[PDB]
Write a protein that binds this DNA or RNA. Structure first.
Ligand SMILES: [Mg+2]
Ligand SMILES: [Mg+2]
Ligand SMILES: [Mg+2]
Ligand SMILES: [Mg+2]
Length: 438
DNA sequence: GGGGTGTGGTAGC
DNA sequence: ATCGCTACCACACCCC
C-alpha cells in the first residue's frame, strides 16, 4: 500500500491505472509514427480516392487477459462465461467485458457491483486481472501484422487496439465488394494468427465516419463493408444515437430533448433540421452530426488524412491524479506538486521541448459530499477549479515551473483536506533548436 | 480583424 | 478495497 504522500505514489498509481496506460500507449504510438515518417510523405492528397479500413480488437483487455490468464483461471471458458477485467470486487471499473457479459447488458466502464446485479442466479461473473505488458505485446503484433501485409498506403494509430488504415485506389483499378471482403478476411486471419488468438473486427467504407459505424455493425469477430453508395434505412436503423463519433452522454441528452427522444440514427435523420441541430448541440458539432448522417466526414476529421504529421504531433503535456488524493496539510500537497513537476519535466526533456504556459487544475470535495465517497479512494462529488500562468521565457527549469505551480495552487484556495484531485499541465510547448545564444 | 481566459465534452480499455 | 488518464476541440465571454 502506497499512500499519496509516499514518494512512490505516482509510480504505483500509473503502474496500476489502465487509463494511464491507454494514454501513454497512444502517445507513444503517435511519436513512433512521426519518427518513422520524418523523411517519408505517405499523406493523402486531393488526387487520391481511398478506402478506409477501421480495425479494432474485440473486447481487447478481456480477450488478452483471458488468453494470458493464470493457472487459477485455466478452466475459464471465453465463449460461455461472462468475463470482466478489473482490479476489485465492488466499486471497481470494468475496463473490458467479453460479449457473453454484454449479452446481459454489462458495459465497459460499469462498476463490478452494478454488473453483478444483471446476472440471473447461478451465473457467475469471472473477474480477470489486468495483463498490461501482454496488452502491449499483442498490440505490437497487431501493428506489425498491418505493416507486413503491404496493402495500406497509410496506417494511422488510433489507440493500443485500433488503427485507421487507408488504401488508395488508382483509377487504374476497379474496386469491388469481393476484393474488399478478401482483404478484410486476410487481415482478420493474419491478426488472429499473429496475436495467437485475438480477434479484430473491421469497418470498411469510403469515409472515416461510415467505417467507424461499419465497425460497430461488424462486431463481434466480423467485418462490414458499407460505402456511401450502399446507405439505406436498414443501415441507419441499426445504430444508437451515441454510436455517432463525437456523441457522448451529454450530447445524447441534448439530442433526446430536442428531437423527441430518437431511438436510432434513422429516427434522428428523419426528424432533424441542420438549424435545429446546431441550436441543440452547437454549430460545429451540429455540422459534424449533419454530415455524419450523410455518411460524410467533416473538415476537422479529414485533417488526419491530409496532414497526419501535424494532427499526431503532441501540443500539450499533463498528468491527472484524481484517485487516492488524501492530504492532511499544505506541505504534503506541495511535495506532491513537486513530484508531479519532476515527472512532467522528464517527459518534456525526452521530447526536447520547453514550455511557455502551465495550468493547475484541482477537484475539491463538494460542501455537502461525504468525506469518504462510495468508491474507495475516489474523488467523489467535486467542484473543479483551474488557473493558468504564462511564463516569461519558455523554460524547462524545475525551480521556475514548480514554484509557479505551487503559487497556482495557493491562488485556488483549496484546503489540503478538501483536495480530491490534481492535474498539472504544460499547455504550450516550444522547440529547442541548435541556436540558444539569446 | 487580432488576442486572451476558464470550462465542457469526448475518446480509447 | 482499488488504481476515476489525458490530448485537444469547441465554446462563452472578456480585451483591444
Ligand atoms: Mg470499439
Ligand atoms: Mg476494441
Ligand atoms: Mg479500440
Ligand atoms: Mg460515440
Amino acid at each position: 500500500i502506497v499512500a499519496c504522500d509516499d514518494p512512490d505514489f505516482l509510480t504505483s498509481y500509473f503502474a496500476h491505472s489502465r487509463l494511464h496506460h491507454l494514454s501513454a500507449w497512444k502517445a507513444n504510438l503517435k511519436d513512433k509514427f512521426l519518427n518513422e515518417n520524418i523523411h517519408k510523405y505517405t499523406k493523402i492528397t486531393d488526387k487520391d480516392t481511398y478506402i478506409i479500413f477501421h480495425i479494432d480488437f474485440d473486447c481487447f483487455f478481456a480477450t488478452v487477459a483471458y488468453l494470458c490468464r493464470s493457472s487459477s483461471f485455466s478452466a475459464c471458458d471465453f465463449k460461455r462465461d461472462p468475463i470482466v477485467v478489473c482490479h476489485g470486487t465492488k466499486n471497481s471499473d470494468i475496463a473490458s467485458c467479453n460479449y457473453v457479459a454484454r449479452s446481459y447488458g454489462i458495459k465497459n466502464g460499469m462498476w463490478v457491483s452494478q454488473a453483478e446485479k444483471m446476472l440471473p442466479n447461478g451465473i457467475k461473473l469471472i473477474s480477470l486481472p489486468y495483463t498490461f505488458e501482454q496488452f502491449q505485446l499483442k498490440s505490437e503484433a497487431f501493428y506489425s501484422t498491418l505493416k507486413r501485409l503491404n496493402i495500406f498506403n497509410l496506417i494511422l494509430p488510433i489507440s493500443i487496439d485500433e488503427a485507421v488504415c487507408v488504401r488508395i485506389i488508382p483509377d487504374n483499378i476497379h474496386n469491388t465488394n469481393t476484393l474488399n471482403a478478401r482483404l478484410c478476411e486476410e487481415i482478420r486471419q493474419e491478426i488472429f494468427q499473429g496475436t495467437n488468438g485475438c480477434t479484430v473486427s473491421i469497418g470498411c467504407s469510403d469515409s472515416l465516419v461510415l467505417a467507424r459505424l461499419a465497425l460497430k455493425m461488424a462486431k463481434p469477430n466480423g467485418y462490414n463493408i458499407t460505402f456511401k453508395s450502399n446507405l439505406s434505412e436498414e443501415f441507419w436503423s441499426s445504430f444508437k444515437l451515441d454510436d455517432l463519433p463525437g456523441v457522448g452522454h451529454s450530447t445524447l441528452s441534448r439530442l433526446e430533448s430536442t428531437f423527441d427522444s430518437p431511438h436510432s440514427l434513422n429516427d434522428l435523420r428523419k426528424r432533424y433540421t441542420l438549424d435545429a441541430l446546431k441550436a441543440s448541440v452547437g454549430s460545429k458539432l451540429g455540422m459534424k452530426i449533419h454530415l455524419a448522417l450523410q455518411g460524410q466526414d467533416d473538415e476537422e476529421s479529414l485533417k488526419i488524412l491530409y496532414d497526419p504529421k501535424e494532427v499526431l504531433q503532441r501540443k500539450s503535456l499533463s498528468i491527472d491524479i484524481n484517485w487516492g488524493i488524501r492530504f492532511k496539510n499544505i506541505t504534503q500537497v506541495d511535495l506532491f506538486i513537486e513530484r508531479g513537476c519532476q515527472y512532467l519535466l522528464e517527459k518534456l526533456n525526452e521530447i526536447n521541448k520547453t514550455t511557455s504556459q502551465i495550468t493547475l487544475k484541482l477537484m475539491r470535495r463538494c460542501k455537502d459530499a461525504p468525506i469518504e465517497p462510495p468508491k474507495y479512494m475516489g474523488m467523489g462529488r467535486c467542484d473543479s477549479f483551474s488557473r493558468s500562468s504564462r511564463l516569461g521565457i519558455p523554460t524547462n527549469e524545475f525551480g521556475i515551473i514548480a514554484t509557479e505551480m505551487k503559487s497556482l495552487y495557493r491562488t485556488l484556495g483549496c484546503p489540503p483536506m478538501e483536495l480530491r484531485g490534481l492535474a498539472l499541465q504544460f499547455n504550450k510547448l516550444v522547440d529547442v533548436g541548435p541556436d540558444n545564444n539569446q
